[PDB]
């Protein structure tokens, strides 16, 4: 089998189409999706026109082997996709109609800046190289672009799936490759993180503030120490999560900031039994009394800060 | 091979059946499980009849090749089912009798709400797609809708596997599309939550409230602190089990709401120090033994409040 | 191909083997195991019946496709075995002798109440569905029923591999079904459990009990609340090495009960504290000399009691 | 098929290429990455050479079967390449253009010794066995090698993709052996190894030297201890993200130097309380003045002497 | 096709070679390593016999279908061998050279009472069984016997590959089988063991003797309680690694004994305190002076004992 020959020198136009049947195992750490879906194509090949009337049939069905058909690709995908054909339909016209239903795992980059109040626009990239007797470019048939009503992504809300109309031709080793980008906008479901992760890591902290109404040099020491390696155990469940970004996620920079807040309280601690030890507690009282308030103010000017720059 | 030609003009009717072999690995953070069950198919196609005396034998046997088989898909699975043939046999008058066992890793969305009292209704939805010459349409053969009394569900109590006999038809992508709903209902087995978790949980929680006998600061932070800790690492433990989830689980309700109780029990031990070092302890005392009483039974009522809310 | 005809009524009967190569992986989160054995089939096929001196040759070597072979399944396996044909022998008289290697992964269920004293009995259900033209039944040929001296099962001692003779006739979707029971018997060795897990356990326990010989409260608050926490550690440690059960484990009552025993030492911790406070030291004195016998004798005679209800 | 056969005595060159097409999984303790390209090959094949005036086709497209194909394989891979074949191109003098897109898991050594501050060389090895008929050469189309301007490898910097030009030709079982070496150079991205390992591990450390402020050797005694059990956390931490090495990796090192420090200082808050009690504070002043200058100084001194070993 | 015939009535020998190109994934608790090879066969097959004159050619190459080939298998293996026949030459008298490319995960016991100082012989055991028609015998061909130079197994020094020449013939369902036994000696890179075990582990313990120079029985507790949890950290990380043994390694009977050394400091800890308390602190400095030589005496002795056992 060899490609439609061109009635003038026209590329050939394939019609895509993307319906999504299922979306599943969202990967942070790995910057992976699974996805299960139908692939609509469509193109005219002259060489199948028929006559209805002579014979006897207003559609012709093939076999995928016995007639020719674009060698489509998906650009971002681990290995090569499961596909199965499902249906190819001629018209009187040579207009092909193909349908398959395919499973793949497609890496698409993930911006963790906002994390977890954050939102991503995955892609999948449709892709054809053109061959020696023709130059074959895609096209997005909108009516067969959709996704199934019970398509849910967990821990995720699907906001859309569209396709950018217009391809991306480039040349890659001198033949022309035809691009599709498929979008799927999703938004995180922060929930969970607020009883979970946040409010703990509050609750632990403000727990180690408890120490600027107490004299208790070895009362405070367990307060505020303890307390810390919990936040250590809240920055390791938090990281493990996620994969090693060259920038600060929010969450990233809240956690880093608690340290900071943990290494001055210990200062204060430090400060206020050295300065008891050495008779000058009324000086001390004046640090711990300021302390009181400096702690929560800074802590929640520092959070308007950061959320300020990150949203 | 092309479908069997209609008599009249009704759809091609393909009866189905599943029959439960294993079911395994159900993940609740994948929202997954897999299972492997007989797969019956049942089409009328007179292209097949034969006479017994010409060819010998009253029933045929075929290789899935050699004969029209219709394409049978499952709308909720992560890749297409590993199926393998038993048994093709055609009767006389063409009534095609089809047998495959089969092996899936289906997506079943579950309700975590009363996790881990919960109970689901896991789905596997067969479907077919109708074609040019003809529409095909599913029916359910209840005679051939069962499972194996050894079927076990790790876990997990089985309470009944039915079909909704009636198919759902719509349209998808300009051609017509039969869907069957086979129901899987499950309970989960919610008696080791109880000594590994659920009592543990409060044990370290009622420890905690021993400070409320205590006037040493010093051991009464490192009771509550100590404890509170403990209760961080079976928050993260619970959470491991779990997907996230846009909603608070009653499991998750009562760890968050634990959390409030550390965090009063910090203050209060907290206040009877302070009050203790103004030379108040007659105060603390009255805050002191108020709490004894107070901590159990706010805690049994916010308890009752919750389990009623969530059942 | 066809089945074999009967010379009368007969139902055909294939004889069975299975010779174990390897076992390994027994993992009871998941409740299977993997093997790699022989498979050995026997049958009289008639039809293929040859004379051995006009033949010239005293056995036929077949190639699968040529002849009919029974298809013979696993009951218990998650996906249909990995198998390769080793032979295919044919005598004069038509007798079969069929050979195959295969790899499978086996779900048998575990029963962990003795745990990690237990022994398990795994099964390799072979299975066989008749035929419209004729019945089939399974028989064991326990000629070939075995396993290789070097099997073994890491964590594992295994004990016997035999098969009951007499296989279980159902009808099963309106056709007959044979199966036979494969039993692998094994028993744990428990060894390594003894100075991993049981002993550390118990050391923890005996330093929380050297606070029944100090009146220092905030020592004692040390000593229990901190071997309180290592026992948590050691709960979720032996948890994440077990499956969810519907009845408590052996190692899961002992577990269970040491914090009934640390709950109450915290109690003895709280009242000596008290009484010390309220002047009323020679009392708390008659309570911490008496904790000194009850601990440890209430530990030996409760786990007396538990070895006797499990073993 | 048999190879082409050579006019003269010349070995059969094989022109490739590699183009990156998508980059991911690079497993640091498992020494492996993903990879998914495009290989190009090309050679001479004149039984293959046409008349493109009477042809009137440029090119002729082959399948693999119909042509001889050479049998090029990566030396370090885990597991055969998963290749689709492309297109294979004829231009009339018989010079055949081969492409095909494959995906593996490659085998590549990494230099763990400036971790996380290192740079990788992952290798791809191409190899070509030569035939009894004529010896098969390697060469390198620099036209036909490269990378996707998207190529992203999670945590790594990508710096370029060569290949050393000239092949290592060599003898192995008795036959010549023609390998080709692709260099992909890579660069961590040590950015997240700062706020979530590095600092915190200096914010305990720098915690435990506030003892050096302190005459409570119970309040030194729990700020030694605990942040060394932090340290201990972040030992194990560091350690599960590398392979066990037969050499000190820079984290390692510092890691281990931190012991050190901690060892130390549990010494000098022992050396103090045992002098106090002794009744000679003057004397436990100065080595507890002299370890608040010392400890911070020796630590910045040892780490420069680090950097300087290690960079 | 069917095996060559005897010319008088000798068994049919098949040379066997294994050249390892790849060594990788020692998994310790699985207890097996993958392994990517070349595999290489010769025996003579006088039908494929040919004069080199009439023909033209010196060599004969033949695809696998085309000529019979000896059924060769590994007994250890998980599942069956990925193989790729890279070449199939035959020389004048018939002599058939045959070589494959293949991957494999082997089992493989492995002997871990002087973990991690231990060495390993990793075996690879060749399989072929005979035929009615006649008997099937392997040999090592030593010329084909080897290694790549750059073969590496992280964590692990490749010492040898040989193989053990003489087959173990034996009868196996009926039929003779004949094994090659080819051993790969390896030796555990014991390095990374010490900065990240061995030595954070005595630190802790030296530290919990810091108790033998302090009087403070709040301390004590503290030192003793609090380095024997982070003793139980170490105990769990090393059993991660390791899979249960029915025996001591040399690490476990190490990390068993500290917890006797832990036991006996809380008793000495204990002891103390209870004298101090009684008024004889004369005796508890007897008690306590002797335990600061006792405790690394002992260990010391403890110590050379146990590596005297093990090595
Ligand atoms: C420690 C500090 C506590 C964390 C503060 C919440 C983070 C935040 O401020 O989150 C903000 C996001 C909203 O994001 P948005 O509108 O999608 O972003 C796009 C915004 N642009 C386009 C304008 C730039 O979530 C919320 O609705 C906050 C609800 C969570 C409350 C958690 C309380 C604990
Ligand atoms: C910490 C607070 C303790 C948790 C309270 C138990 C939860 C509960 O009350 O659970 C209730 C569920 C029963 O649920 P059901 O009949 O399946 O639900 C459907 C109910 N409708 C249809 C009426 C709405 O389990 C039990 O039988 C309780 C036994 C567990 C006791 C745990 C002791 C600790
Ligand atoms: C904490 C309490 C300590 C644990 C007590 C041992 C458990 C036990 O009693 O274990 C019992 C099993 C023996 O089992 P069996 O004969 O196979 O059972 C079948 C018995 N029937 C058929 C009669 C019912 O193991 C042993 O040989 C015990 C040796 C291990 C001692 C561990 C010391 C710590
Ligand atoms: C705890 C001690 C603090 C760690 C010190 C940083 C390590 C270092 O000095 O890292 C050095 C590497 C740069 O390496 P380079 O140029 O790639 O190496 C090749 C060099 N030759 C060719 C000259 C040999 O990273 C940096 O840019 C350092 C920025 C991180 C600062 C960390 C703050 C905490
Ligand atoms: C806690 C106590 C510290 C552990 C003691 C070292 C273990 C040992 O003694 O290790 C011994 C092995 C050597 O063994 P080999 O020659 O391979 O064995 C075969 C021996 N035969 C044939 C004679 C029986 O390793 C070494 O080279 C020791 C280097 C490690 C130093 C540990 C520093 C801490
Ligand atoms: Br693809
Ligand atoms: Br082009
Ligand atoms: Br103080
Ligand atoms: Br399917
Ligand atoms: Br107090
Ligand atoms: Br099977
Ligand atoms: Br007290
Ligand atoms: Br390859
Ligand atoms: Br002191
Ligand atoms: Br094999
Ligand atoms: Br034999
Ligand atoms: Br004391
Ligand atoms: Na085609
Ligand atoms: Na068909
Ligand atoms: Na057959
Ligand atoms: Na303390
Ligand atoms: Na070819
Ligand atoms: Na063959």
Redesign the interface.
């Known amino acids: 089998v ?1 490609p439609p020959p061109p009635i003038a020198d026209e590329p050939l136009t394939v019609n895509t ?1 993307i ?1 999504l ?2 979306c ?2 969202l990967d942070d750490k ?3 999706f ?1 996805v ?1 879906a ?1 692939l ?1 194509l469509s193109w005219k090949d002259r060489r199948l026109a028929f006559d209805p009337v002579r014979s006897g049939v ?2 012709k ?1 093939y076999e995928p082997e016995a007639i020719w058909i674009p ?1 489509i ?1 998906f ?6 996709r ?1 596909a ?1 054909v ?2 190819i ?1 001629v018209s009187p016209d040579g207009t092909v109609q193909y ?1 398959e ?1 395919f ?1 793949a795992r497609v ?1 698409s ?1 993930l911006d963790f800046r906002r994390y977890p109040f954050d939102s991503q626009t995955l892609h999948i990239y449709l892709i054809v ?1 053109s ?3 023709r130059n074959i470019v895609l096209a997005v048939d909108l ?2 672009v959709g996704k ?1 009503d019970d398509v ?1 992504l ?2 995720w809300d699907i906001e859309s799936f569209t396709a950018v109309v217009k391809p991306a031709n480039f040349a ?2 001198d033949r022309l490759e035809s691009k599709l980008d498929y979008q799927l906008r999703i938004s995180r ?1 922060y ?3 607020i ?2 992760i946040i ?2 890591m509050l ?2 902290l ?2 180690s503030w ?1 120490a600027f ?7 405070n ?3 505020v ?6 936040h ?6 938090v ?1 493990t999560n996620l ?6 996620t929010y969450t ?1 920079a809240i ?2 900031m608690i ?1 900071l807040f ?2 001055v309280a ?2 204060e601690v ?1 400060v206020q ?2 300065l008891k ?1 050495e008779s000058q507690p009324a000086r001390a009282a004046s640090i711990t009394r300021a302390s009181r308030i400096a702690f929560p103010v800074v802590f929640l000017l520092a959070n308007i800060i950061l959320a300020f720059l990150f949203f």
Do not use: C
């Open positions: 060899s189409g319906y049947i299922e599943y195992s790995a910057e992976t699974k299960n139908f609509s207003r559609v069905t060698e690709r650009v971002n995908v681990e290995n090569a499961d199965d499902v249906d339909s349908l239903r499973s890496l980059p190289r061959v020696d007797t009516e067969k199934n849910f967990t821990g890659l080793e479901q929930f969970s993180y009883p979970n409010l703990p609750f632990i403000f727990i408890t109404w107490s004299t208790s040099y070895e009362a020491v367990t307060l120490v303890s307390t810390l390696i919990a250590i155990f809240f920055n390791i469940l990281e994969p090693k970004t060259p920038y600060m990233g956690i880093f340290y943990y290494f210990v200062i430090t039994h050295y030890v």
